[PDB]
Amino acid sequence: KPQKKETYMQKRAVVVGREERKLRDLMQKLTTIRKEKIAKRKAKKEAQ
Amino acid sequence: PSSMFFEHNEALVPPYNVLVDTNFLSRTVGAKLPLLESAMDCLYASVN
Amino acid sequence: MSSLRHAIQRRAHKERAQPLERQRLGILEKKKDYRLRARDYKKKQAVLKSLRQKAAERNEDEFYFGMMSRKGPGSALTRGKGFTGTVDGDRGNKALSVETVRLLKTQD
Amino acid sequence: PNRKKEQRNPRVKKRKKYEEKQKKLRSVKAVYKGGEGPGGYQGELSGIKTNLVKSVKL
Amino acid sequence: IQILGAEKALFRALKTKHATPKYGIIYHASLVGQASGPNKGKIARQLAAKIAL
Amino acid sequence: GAKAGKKVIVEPHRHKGVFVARGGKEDLLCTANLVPGESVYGEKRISVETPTKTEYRIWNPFRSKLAAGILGGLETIYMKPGSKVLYLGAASGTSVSHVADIVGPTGAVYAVEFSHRSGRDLINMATRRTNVIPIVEDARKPMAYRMLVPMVDVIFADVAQPDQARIVGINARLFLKQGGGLLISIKASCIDSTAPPEQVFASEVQKLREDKFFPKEQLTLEPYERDHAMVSCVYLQKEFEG
Amino acid sequence: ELSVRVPQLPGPPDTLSDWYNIPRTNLTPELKRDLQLLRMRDVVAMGKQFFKKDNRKDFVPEYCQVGTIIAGATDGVSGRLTRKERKRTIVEEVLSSDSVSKYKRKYHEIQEHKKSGRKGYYKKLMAARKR
Amino acid sequence: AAWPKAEDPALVQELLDCVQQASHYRQLKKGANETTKSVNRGTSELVILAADTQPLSIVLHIPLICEEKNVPYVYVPSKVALGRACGVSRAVIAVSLTSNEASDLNSKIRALRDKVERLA
């Protein structure tokens, strides 16, 4: 069940900086483009 | 292997290396047929 | 054969669209979209028929040992308004002792 | 039927067939294609795979 | 005075909610080098207090 | 390219003593530097500060036929750390430094060079590395260094001679253990400039088999050098060590 | 001469004896980002340079060591990263490089293709029916 | 100092004729720095070095790289003749003539480097 109250381990979380958020966003974008590229390559190989 | 362009062996140029099997050898003695002379007359090139 | 046909024999037949006086209702479902709809419904009904067979042929006295470490689906009466038939799982959180919370609050 | 601009000229067709069959050859074997460039050695530019044995086992 | 010199690890730990260093320059004294185990950190605390006095 | 200052990570290769340093857009091959902090022939090297003395040196495949063969994918190169290697054709000691860096301090590399100025470069790099000994003598006459070479485990042979198989045959008859590994680098244009290279390689393999080797692997190291082959063979056995 | 000994009696190896003691991976989050980047380095150079498809189940090897290229003595004018480009990790170098806008463009095309018909589309159809 | 010196009986002139043929075929690099760069880039098949050079250390430094890369090298006795054979209008002391995958010059190259490997 999705928790509705905010726990103490969620309250005490450090606000992350700007450079680490830029690295996080870059890693998100690279992982999505990798997943889409892999799905396209697998579809082409299944057709062949 | 090198010198292979899509089932075309570019490694075989004269003098041709020819491996001889026992069936071929028994039948080329049975047909009164000289071995190196007929191989050279077939390939128009020096065989070893 | 395939060489005994002209290019006008090979030419594709186009698909008509939904009429413009009726385009608010969505796309006009043709055979391909209907096949997708029917595949999804037959798959969901196959899973539901297997679940109904499994719920019908259930031993009322069965005893697995995960029943001593899981909370059952219960009933609407025992659970309450928040009753789905799904067995609730753990999110990973745990009740945390006082010495470790003393350490965490000194860090905060 | 409708045929191609490549098919109307028998030399240009055999030029484009050779360019694409020399291209299919690089995807199977390895061509030499010049040694180290003028810039030097910039690393093995497309991967190094360690668990791959590509020798003709005599 | 306990954690003079260990300030990089100290402020890294304080800003990321890690555990702070136990000692700084005091580690290369004589009297904290005879201990071993957690008694090293205890003697570092007591020695830093006596150094402040 | 692989510019200076880029961060790479250094993982072990499948072979012993060789590492592969991968990072970013270029994965390259390296060996652990025996004398740290100095390059032999101005190569790029890799410094890692362990949690100083650890440095790795990059192994150019266009310059050395052994690294060309390793990137081609030999099944084994026979030189584990602590194994004696007789190098024939040690011209100026560029790849001999990487072979010595493979075999480490407890191994030994007997580097035979014939020419004298290449002998000067070899004696300089063997002054730096204390496990390679330099032997300035003709490899065609192995009676000259029979006082110097004990029974080695691996032979590397990078001589470009037409009598290459006879040279390696007499050198391995004199200084190779029973079941001895060797890697010979055959250059077809120097063996037989008229004949096709596959026929040249088969003839050289047959000559090695007449000179009592058992060949076990052969690769044409093609994207790094044209008409070159590397033949791996075991002396007087079928398995390598025993 | 001959002394009383010190009695010193009280799994996987730490350092590889055959590979000159590469230490075991201290699997820091920065090294984990670097290893994810190394398995996705085909995507980083966006089709300009393809790589050998090495796809194991675990991308983290057992023994690694993060090092730095020092210097080729023959090339030092353009084969040398400057002071404002020598960054700490590999992901920081990828982010400091160009084509980050190219990654963002490809990501937004993928996001449009994946939001193509899922649920905002059906909310819009239901609103157009209810109007 | 130049121990693989070419001798008189129709080997120097075979060398210079092959040099002129390759210079017509545009497969030849002239001068010491271009020979050095061609050998270090590995495209060289054979390298001719003059022996009449004022102080000989230039055509002594080239054989070290040639022995390290294992390409044949040979000394002809006149830099004026080498420049005249190349077609330069200057005296050339070092000539390296490269390799191409398809020519008819490569037969002369192969016979010449067989004679040079017999000379060494």
Curated annotation (Swiss-Prot), chain C:
Cellular compartment(s): Nucleus, Nucleolus
Similarity comment: Belongs to the UTP11 family.
Domain of life: Eukaryota
Compositional bias (Basic and acidic residues): 15-24
Broad class of where this protein is predominantly found: nucleus
GO cellular component, one term: small-subunit processome
Record's subunit section: Component of the ribosomal small subunit (SSU) processome composed of at least 40 protein subunits and snoRNA U3. Interacts with snoRNA U3.
Organism: Chaetomium thermophilum (strain DSM 1495 / CBS 144.50 / IMI 039719)
Covered range of the whole protein: 1 to 108 of 270
Gene Ontology biological-process entries: rRNA processing
Keyword vocabulary terms for this entry: Nucleus, Ribonucleoprotein, Ribosome biogenesis, rRNA processing
Protein's name according to its UniProt entry: U3 small nucleolar RNA-associated protein 11
Record region (Disordered): 1-24
General function of this protein: Involved in nucleolar processing of pre-18S ribosomal RNA.
Cytoplasm in keyword set: no
